[PDB]
């Protein structure tokens, strides 16, 4: 796997409902501490890195 995941890259060639679901999944994964999240500015890319708890898939 990779060192980081770009939400905007994940959402390339997705439709609005699919993109929103990926955004929401980042919020859930962060709550579960499966990822850390950074966003440089409002509406910039959102970057996930591995969080302090293990997670499947």
């Amino acid at each position: 796997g990779a060192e980081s995941i770009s939400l905007l890259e994940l959402c390339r060639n997705t439709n609005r409902k699919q993109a929103a679901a990926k955004f929401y999944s980042f919020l859930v994964l962060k709550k579960q501490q499966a990822i850390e999240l950074t966003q440089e500015e409002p509406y910039s890319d959102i970057i996930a890195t591995p969080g302090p708890r293990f997670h499947g898939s």
Binding site: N15, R16, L27
Partner: protein, 357 residues
Amino acid sequence: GFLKLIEIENFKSYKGRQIIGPFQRFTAIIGPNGSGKSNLMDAISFVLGEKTSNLRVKTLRDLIHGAPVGKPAANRAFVSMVYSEEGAEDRTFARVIVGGSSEYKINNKVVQLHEYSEELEKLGILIKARNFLVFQGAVESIAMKNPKERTALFEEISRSGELAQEYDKRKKEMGSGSLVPRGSGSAKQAFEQIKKERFDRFNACFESVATNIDEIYKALSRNSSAQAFLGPENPEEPYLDGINYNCVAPGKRFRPMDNLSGGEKTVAALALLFAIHSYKPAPFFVLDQIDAALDNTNIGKVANYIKEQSNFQAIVISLKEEFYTKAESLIGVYPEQGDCVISKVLTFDLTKYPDAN
């Protein structure tokens, strides 16, 4: 104008200083349970003048992050709203907790609550009527309220209620309360004159709302068979008794009102909310989980109404992707681990993606 952004510092779970937004014309706040969405609703209420009793705390200082566990993160906290209008510089309205009491500011100049409220009123933000804010679990009650409580809303917005005390005094001076009232001459004319003043103030507002509500209920319902009727129980003195609200759902036979579904009541409530706006426009609405009882058909019709109107801005909190995927942008709330709940936000632009296949 419109709400460009909210800035929050150490308010409830919003630790540190955070920008909320910027907002688009239709923005949805979303996030997993427990993340802090309801605290963000509280922050908006707070900067728009809500009393501390309605913010789920016993004392103002308990709104500072960490205070409900004896570990306050600061001796101050604030919420601020940046209000924007075409051709005008941004105006910042802030409420700061200092010394355990509220300090109000407009463009960083300290004002008293009276002036803060007066300036908000000039923008269409009525911090007494609070017709721009719908809390979770409350949208249906708007359509199913007591007729008498509906009258009180109209007396507040129309300012006819400012005349009720003089009305009551003149009514008694004219003989109301006697076995056989004998009104004549100047005492009777004094009562008729204040009655007329109260009637005129009330109807300037009410008649406008009642004559616009049917089209809005239709426009919401997207159906000419829907009908909405607002009428006073007392036509001669509308402010004295209840305001009846009855609807006919689109493509349905008439049912009383309590027999409507939660979704149908929700749409009736929204029609009244937006009919009030047609008379006294608010710059934005904050709608907390108003889609809870709506099916997917009604979610689409409500979202379409918002998008084909955004004369107002809509800020919604939603648990339903069918609704929030119709917004222009999402503000996502997530929790951080700590001594107490810490909330932070992300922003996401949905307009970059086709809403199609």
